[PDB]
């Protein structure tokens, strides 16, 4: 059969009061509902919050949650748990505002195993949440603590723990550094990340400012100050300041940027004055790193949307708005010429990988992969290309036509008669080894595939990144309404929402003009739903 | 007389010579349905970066440009030359600078007047022009000098060229200017993401002064640096220095883009006021901006190449005898905008010489004005929309309806299009702005894929661009010129250059406002523009 395109009113109707102590029940069957990404059971989700791995290995994801509407507001912290970052268990709402005229904005969570806070005299797995409380006139930082492993939180009796008398002061990311707690918090409309320190998470002292770096956009948000291992040597690492900006991103709306540098417990110093954008498309925002991971592990997740159209995407009839990105493992590397680069790769996908749909070593060919049998409507693919040494040593031996095309094509079996009726691909990827646009990689969601997408004036159709080195590896995940691509071992990555009128039913992978002796290896797998 | 511009031209108008003409102006047919009528485009062939931009002592503006006279793609670079007194009415001139042989190219550079004969080239004239440009060879990029004594038409190479080599193949686009007591060159160490600053007493001996490295967006290369002094918009007695750098490829929208840095320059060092990156244009088709040398005091005048390296060599205009047009000429200022602070202002240079008949004037709020310009033979229009919100709405924006918006749509001609079936009526370009609601301050500029078979199929021809204001939109000015739309927001605070290649020519425009607060004043003015070629 075919995934429903709209759900019964009982699956999409939202409560008039926020459920306390109860898990919100969700129908995850909609034709747009991602099957291996997190999305809330009902309602509207945005930024990931309080991300941490507990001592039993369970990942806790919290998130900005409107349980009452399909648009942003009434923010609570939703909560889901996973042991593998793919199979999620919805949990009751973790943090509630004190009244209907306040909202629980973004923040972070840490384990306090040594009871620095004083909240945990008889436990070693105390969790402290540090979050922004939004009121009509102020944004302040507050603490709440959990003794049950991060399910139920109690507000700190002397909240707030930090106010500067500002209405633009939010998204505290807290972490342990040697002998004290560090908070990175956004003085959002001043384009400043403020660094504060604390011995106990409740009394905070100003250390330093990081101001007017990289792209300003209209606000700094969701700062993450994290230590990231080197891809080619995970014994080595550097600090990275990751800043989300919204609005005012170059593609429009929201985007993440980063700065490699040094951190010494009080001051972050960037290695240079350059601006670096994390993702070359527009649906990757508010990346948050999981606290309490071990040495050599950098784990993050982002909200896979854009503030310019997140509240207008056509999924509310399927009981949700917004999904998280694939969970990510991060590295730092140097790429040819450009130097510093934030590597993003999908966190181990093995737990959701299903049957092989195609395995091919054919070069200069077109492989058609039908996945109308894959009930998840989600696929993974990996394409490796190894050029002959002669082509690496002399690039003038590569034909101008040497290229790769990947197209995701609409289902004939589950086609909508109401949409475009187009045979337009839902999504395309094009790369040129040489010619006039040498190294250029285009990722597109053709307007002709989506009535909604064509009409939305911010739903940009085409994205590109230009490689210096030849493309040697490409990995992708398509999950009903999302495509993520990872180029050259995660050197470059892009997160793109797609809302085709007809569900994707097949994909074509074409290579052509590749030099004599070029090795091509393609693998495609159906993914297994984590919700069904 | 024709009723519709030709979409394809006779082979005589498009066929390119097999040898580069010397001493002769290349003849051009400027009638194609995509040929801009108030922007500069080469008579035939392929153009890119503006070069050697300067005003001579007679008040004549000289535009040079990267020129392939032999193909409709980049290569065989010479300097083309056109002159104007007003930066709208252009006169094509013979090719100004030629490579020494068939295996070298004249890459980008700048030109200056040397009235005091610092160079030694001009013992008997105060009208000497010196061009400083990159010579590209298979293995090297070096800086060379050439001088003109006839007012910038014919150049002679300096006998001891090159004037500057560092043994690099990525070393180009020198912009030279006078600072107090010496010449300054800003030149790109392109693949090192460094602008090198050299000084010279005479334009032929250059000394290294300082580096400006790894600032703003890196892209894949730094190109065409401009280090210029720009007056304050609200106070012409004040100014600051600006480092303007083009990057290609690797721009965030894909391909090529311009960025800038406000700062201080003292003759040897440029120091940015902060570590922020600032993008000049919020669309895709504005690159290699160059400032005119030797303007009057307090006039900052620039022009850019209105294209993108990802599709400039593939745009469907070669059948109309050209590839590439320059942007409108721009008057530049610096200002502070709400919250963001420093901002490069770009406004169209005085358009009065090309303004034709008024097509529409409206004071109506919450209405739709339909403007037919099928009778405007230039197929080019200017519009200005002013909006004055009531003070109550300025002081408290929660008083503005979520519906408060402006929509501008450019619609295909019924008079010059006989096309039928799906997509036939798609707008060629749209502009949408919201005062409030979920995307408050958001301005979208789009070129619908459905309007252009070529644009839909090109994988780099991005359909939608946006910029988000902090302040309400109070002014919007635009020029549509056959195949180009440029928009200027809030007195040139924000600007965008966007190419459009609709299957049918544009014949009409709709301007709609809705949901505007009670007592909002709106003024809309639209004029046909007069062709500068015809
Ligand atoms: C993947 O899709 C792209 C289109 O997005 C294909 O690229 C295009 O390929 C053709 C064939 O090489 C190009 O045509 C050629 O034009 C040049 C002149 O520019 C000519 O010298 C060649 O003989 C040929 O006729 C076309 O320009 C090009 N389009 C773009 C936008 O670059 C690509 O071939 C596809 N690759 C595969 C493996 O399917
Ligand atoms: C001012 O900036 C210029 C341009 O960045 C500097 O010259 C450049 O210096 C670097 C470092 O010495 C050179 O990079 C290196 O190149 C060699 C050759 O391929 C390579 O073996 C090394 O691994 C390294 O990447 C670069 O070639 C060179 N570029 C140019 C155009 O000369 C210059 O040193 C700076 N001067 C000062 C005083 O800061
Ligand atoms: C650190 O950064 C903050 C934020 O930019 C600075 O505080 C701001 O200071 C300016 C100038 O007085 C005020 O106009 C803003 O309203 C303040 N913003 C906030 C969030 O308070 C602070 O002065 C900086 N401190 C240091 C030591 O540089
Ligand atoms: C201009 O066009 C836009 C659509 O692009 C109109 O926007 C919609 O406005 C209503 C409120 O009036 C919202 O509820 C919709 O969500 C908006 N659409 C989008 C895509 O955001 C806008 O009203 C139009 N304005 C005028 C003056 O015609
Ligand atoms: C709601 O709580 C916030 C602090 O949490 C307080 O500032 C505000 O006054 C409260 N509002 C009402 C209506 O009680
Ligand atoms: C809790 O810790 C206190 C010290 O603060 C100690 O006296 C007591 O034995 C502990 N109680 C339990 C149940 O472990
Ligand atoms: C981890 O498991 C232990 C033993 O089963 C249990 O006591 C503890 O509560 C668990 N911790 C968390 C954070 O769930
Ligand atoms: C945290 O440390 C500060 C500074 O010593 C102290 O004043 C404050 O009381 C501490 N808070 C708690 C809850 O221990
Ligand atoms: C951190 O480094 C800064 C210089 O960037 C220095 O001023 C400060 O004292 C250092 N702090 C510590 C804790 O070493
Ligand atoms: C990248 O190269 C720089 C030298 O330019 C070096 O200092 C840094 O450690 C390198 N980083 C990685 C991740 O290899
Ligand atoms: C691919 O096709 C190119 C272009 O026709 C040809 O030169 C080459 O032999 C082919 N290479 C492979 C690996 O099949
Ligand atoms: C591509 O290469 C990577 C690393 O060498 C490997 O893990 C992967 O299985 C390869 N994929 C294919 C389709 O051969
Ligand atoms: C062309 O002129 C350049 C610059 O003088 C020189 O380097 C190059 O060798 C010349 N090429 C030939 C083929 O003469
Ligand atoms: C330019 O000035 C330098 C330094 O005084 C001098 O050596 C050089 O000969 C001059 N060049 C000419 C062409 O006069
Ligand atoms: C220009 O300023 C720099 C510092 O920014 C200084 O080192 C240099 O001496 C100055 N040069 C002149 C000519 O004043
Ligand atoms: C912008 O504001 C800064 C700080 O007040 C000031 O130094 C600068 O001169 C201003 N620039 C303009 C163009 O008004
Ligand atoms: C425009 O219409 C809105 C209702 O949509 C109304 O509130 C407003 O008063 C009108 N404004 C003007 C200037 O007529
Ligand atoms: C808008 O006002 C400006 C001056 O503020 C004026 O130059 C322009 O002609 C006006 N345009 C309209 C639409 O009234
Ligand atoms: C969801 O859209 C589908 C199109 O496949 C319809 O069949 C259904 O009625 C609902 O509108
Ligand atoms: C979504 O809307 C469709 C209308 O076709 C129904 O099929 C479904 O029950 C739900 O209301
Ligand atoms: C509300 O009712 C619908 C059917 O109309 C069910 O799908 C759902 O489980 C709930 O009972
Ligand atoms: C649940 O909510 C959805 C989205 O608003 C509706 O389409 C449905 O009928 C029910 O109200
Ligand atoms: C669930 O119930 C608790 C009980 O006090 C409320 O505080 C909460 O807002 C929600 O309604
Ligand atoms: C969570 O909400 C459910 C709704 O039925 C209750 O059963 C529970 O007591 C808690 O309020
Ligand atoms: C230019 O394009 C137009 C499209 O209608 C044709 O009429 C003409 O013959 C030429 O192809
Ligand atoms: C433009 O179209 C004409 C035919 O109308 C041709 O002569 C020319 O080669 C180009 O295709
Ligand atoms: C002149 O050039 C144009 C573009 O290639 C052709 O359409 C025409 O036939 C002639 O070759």
Numbering used by the authors:
A (entry chain B): 142 to 673
B (entry chain A): 140 to 673
Which text from the study accompanies this structure?
Rhodotorula dairenensis β-fructofuranosidase is a highly glycosylated enzyme with broad substrate specificity that catalyzes the synthesis of 6-kestose and a mixture of the three series of fructooligosaccharides (FOS), fructosylating a variety of carbohydrates and other molecules as alditols.
A single homogeneous band with a molecular weight of 85–90 kDa was observed in the SDS gel after a combined α1-2,3,6 mannosidase/Endo H enzymatic treatment, which allowed crystal structure determination at 2.05 Å resolution. RdINV was indexed in the C2221 space group, with two molecules in the asymmetric unit and 37.4% solvent content. They are associated in a “butterfly” shape to form a tight homodimer related by a well-defined two-fold symmetry axis, similar to that previously described in the SoFfase homolog. The interface is mostly formed by blades IV and V from each catalytic domain and the β7β8 loop from their corresponding β-sandwich domain through twelve hydrogens bonds (monomer description is included in the following paragraph). At least six O-glycosylation sites (Thr146, Ser147, Ser151, Ser153, Thr161, Thr163) located at the beginning of the chain and 13 N-glycosylation sites (Asn197, Asn240, Asn255, Asn263, Asn341, Asn350, Asn405, Asn475, Asn505, Asn514, Asn525, Asn535, Asn546) distributed over the two domains were clearly defined at the electron density map within each monomer. A PEG and a glycerol molecule were captured in the catalytic site of chain A at subsites −1 and +1, whereas glycerol and Bis-Tris were trapped in chain B. A remarkable feature is the presence of a di-sulfur bridge linking Cys143 to Cys555 that connects the prominent Pro551-Pro566 loop to the visible portion of the N-terminus and possibly helps in keeping the structural integrity of the Ser140-Asp168 region that has been observed in the crystal. Moreover, the Bis-Tris molecule shows one of its hydroxyl groups very close to the fructose and, thus, is in a proper position to act as an acceptor substrate in a putative transfructosylating reaction.
